[PDB]
Amino acid sequence: QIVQGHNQVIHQYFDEKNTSGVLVIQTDKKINLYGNALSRANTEYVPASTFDMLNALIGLENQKTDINEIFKWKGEKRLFTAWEKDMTLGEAMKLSAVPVYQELARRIGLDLMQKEVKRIGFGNAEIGQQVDNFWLVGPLKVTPIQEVEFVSQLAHTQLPFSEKVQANVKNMLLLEESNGYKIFGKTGWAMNIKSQVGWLTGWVEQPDGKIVAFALNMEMRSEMPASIRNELLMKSLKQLNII
Numbered sequence: 001q002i003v004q005g006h007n008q009v010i011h012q013y014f015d016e017k018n019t020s021g022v023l024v025i026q027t028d029k030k031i032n033l034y035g036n037a038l039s040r041a042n043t044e045y046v047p048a049s050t051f052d053m054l055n056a057l058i059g060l061e062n063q064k065t066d067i068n069e070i071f072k073w074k075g076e077k078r079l080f081t082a083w084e085k086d087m088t089l090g091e092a093m094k095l096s097a098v099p100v101y102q103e104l105a106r107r108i109g110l111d112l113m114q115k116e117v118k119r120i121g122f123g124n125a126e127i128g129q130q131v132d133n134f135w136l137v138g139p140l141k142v143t144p145i146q147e148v149e150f151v152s153q154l155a156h157t158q159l160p161f162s163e164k165v166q167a168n169v170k171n172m173l174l175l176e177e178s179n180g181y182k183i184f185g186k187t188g189w190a191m192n193i194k195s196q197v198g199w200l201t202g203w204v205e206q207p208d209g210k211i212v213a214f215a216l217n218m219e220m221r222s223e224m225p226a227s228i229r230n231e232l233l234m235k236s237l238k239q240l241n242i243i
Contacts, residue, residue, distance in 0.1 A: 002041075002145065005032030010236050014218070017228060021218030023236050024148045027211075031145065034236065040217055044124055044141035045197040048188035049096040051135035053154065053169060055104055056089060058116045060165045064107040065089055067168050071100045090172040096187070102132040119160065122150065137192060144217040147201045151185070152213035155203040173202065180207035181243045187229055189220055196220040200229045204242055212242045 005025065014021045014036035022040040025032045033041050059065050070086050078084050083097040092100035105113060110131040118125045123142025127134040134140045142150075153159045157166045173184040185202015198220040203213040216233050225231075237243045 001029065002031045002033070004038060005034050005240075007034045007038075009239050010034040011036050013232060013235055013239070017232060019218045019220075019224075019228075019232075021216065021232070022144055023233070024144045024215045024217070025240065025242070026148045026152045026213040027242075031148065034240075035218075037219075041144050044143050045199075045217065046138055046190040046193065047123065047135050047140060047142050047147070048190040048197070048199060049098075050142075050147060050186050050188040050199045050201050051140070052093055052096060052101050053151070053173070053186055054117070054120065054122055055101050055108075055135070056093060056169050056172065057154075057159065057161050057165060058108055058113065059089070059104045060168060061116075061161050062108065062112060065104055071103060093169075093172040093186075098136070105132050120150075122146070136190070144199075144201075144215040147199070147217075148213050148215035151201055151203055151215070152211070155184070155205075155211045155213060175202065179243070181205070183243075185214070187226075189226070191220075196222075198229050200233050204237065206242075 010023060020037040022033060022035040022038055024041055067090060070088060071092065072086050073084060078099060082095055087097060087100065113131055114127050117127055123140060123146055126139045128139045154166060154170060157163055159166055170184065173186060174182060175185055176183045182205040183202060185200060188199035190197045198218050200216040203211050205211055216229060
């Protein structure tokens with residue numbers, strides 16, 4: 001049941017940021033839509049870094065890597081200085097270090113990747129012929145509703161992967177943690193489109209254990225702070241009494 005939530009206030013929040021966005025909340029097979037551009041909820045977009053969650057699942061499931069492996073930095077200048085080091089898959093997750101996730105995609109290889117993305121049904125499930133950038137520039141696209149369903153299932157260990165793998169990938173995703181409320185998830189930003197999409201997709205684990213999943217999806221400009229996504233998400237979650 002996908003419905004427009006009580007949206008008068010969150011609408012304003014999106015307006016007051018001069019963006020066009022949607023916030024999708026899933027709380028036990030109720031999905032509510034918020035924001036100032038609700039039609040985004042059913043529009044496919046490149047997932048960008050949010051795909052790392054699925055890449056990691058597939059790689060661990062198929063034993064292409066393990067959570068102790070240290071991915072070596074060979075010495076080349078990377079897009080961010082923070083990425084310029086040896087790191088594990090979990091540290092790569094937190095930093096969204098693309099080269100590590102590209103190295104993992106190339107181990108998985110094109111077939112296995114396509115077969116796994118189709119089995120999971122992630123978005124349009126098209127990865128094309130280039131195994132190491134399909135989630136960055138296309139052709140892979142996915143809706144915000146499809147993303148919230150995906151993270152909700154990960155949070156509940158309901159994806160079609162091993163329980164241990166799912167637990168290991170959840171453990172990589174912790175963003176912030178106060179008042180007994182934990183926020184897990186993954187930002188993404190498809191900086192090269194004709195239109196730049198920003199994601200923050202994840203869930204809240206409330207103190208009593210309950211899970212509320214989210215997927216924020218908005219139009220990004222270069223004028224904006226990267227932090228704008230976390231700011232709009234947290235303001236909205238507070239207004240909705242989810243945190």
